Design a protein around this ligand. Structure first.
Ligand SMILES: CC(C)(COP(=O)(O)OP(=O)(O)OC[C@H]1O[C@@H](n2cnc3c(N)ncnc32)[C@H](O)[C@@H]1OP(=O)(O)O)[C@@H](O)C(=O)NCCC(=O)NCCS
Ligand SMILES: [Mg+2]
Length: 228
């Protein structure tokens, strides 16, 4: 099938990026030796997911011109990319995906996949602002689980943010606004950061523009920031 993450990478960015995805855990994918301590005591389902996602990452790197390398885990769980590379990883039920780019062209990337299923009201209240719960249902087509799409967009926001700030970003630290395309299955979002927006260097992260998509029972979101 066609790759789902394509739908949330706009033309302005897609040619600076490489990506790969899978919808299962193929047998005989293996970790690189350096990675094995990370999943040595993990349950098989996590072990295999980890392996598959790292495999997608190396396939994408390969497309970028980067030889296969181990991808370790940093201090706050972030992937350790090779120098000169930025990227993002995501998994959920029925999806494993990776997007990478060269850091000379791409400042940061965050992606996230979720099942297109409802969230509990308890979760919705923890991850949303009162104003989002008022605004989004009007912006989004009936039938979309906009609670999950919101949640997915917030997680993508953190992933694009952390490599540029090395600071925490909570769910109530960004206000997300949505629009829907005519298809009703794709659209844009903007995350407005509500805390100190300063990057470690360069321009501040004040308003982050992303894309969302619903297809094959999945929500995909992505934010891509280019180097200017
Ligand atoms: C870490 C988190 C963002 C992961 O998102 P998720 O949708 O639950 O799970 P995903 O499978 O999509 O993503 C997991 C991957 O995120 C990546 N990740 C973890 N921490 C990260 C960080 N600090 N920066 C960037 N990427 C990170 C990892 O690569 C991980 O996979 P791996 O363990 O195989 O290497 C999420 O679990 C979380 O804890 N969020 C709290 C922060 C947040 O979302 N704030 C909202 C800001 S508006
Ligand atoms: Mg997710």
């Amino acid at each position: 099938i066609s790759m789902l993450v394509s739908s949330v990478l706009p033309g302005t960015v897609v040619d600076d990026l490489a990506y790969a995805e899978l919808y299962s855990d193929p047998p005989g994918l293996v970790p690189l030796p350096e990675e094995e301590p990370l999943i040595a005591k993990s349950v098989a389902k996590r072990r295999n997911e980890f392996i598959t996602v790292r495999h997608c990452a190396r396939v994408a790197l390969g497309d970028l011109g980067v030889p296969p390398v181990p991808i370790l885990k940093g201090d706050k769980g972030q992937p350790c990319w090779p120098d000169g590379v930025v990227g993002s990883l995501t998994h959920c039920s029925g999806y494993r995906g990776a997007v990478v780019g060269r850091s000379a062209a791409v400042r940061s990337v965050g992606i996230d996949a979720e099942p297109h299923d409802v969230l509990s009201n308890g979760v919705l209240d923890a991850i949303s602002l009162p104003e989002e719960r008022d605004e989004i249902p009007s912006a989004m087509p009936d039938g979309l689980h906009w609670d999950r799409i919101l949640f997915c967009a917030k997680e993508a926001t953190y992933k694009v943010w952390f490599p540029l700030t090395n600071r925490w970003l909570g769910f109530e630290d960004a206000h997300i606004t949505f629009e829907a395309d005519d298809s009703g299955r794709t659209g844009r979002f903007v995350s407005r950061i509500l805390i100190d927006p300063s990057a470690l260097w360069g321009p501040p992260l004040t308003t982050l523009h992303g894309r969302w998509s619903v297809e094959r029972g999945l929500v995909l979101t992505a934010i891509v920031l280019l180097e200017h």
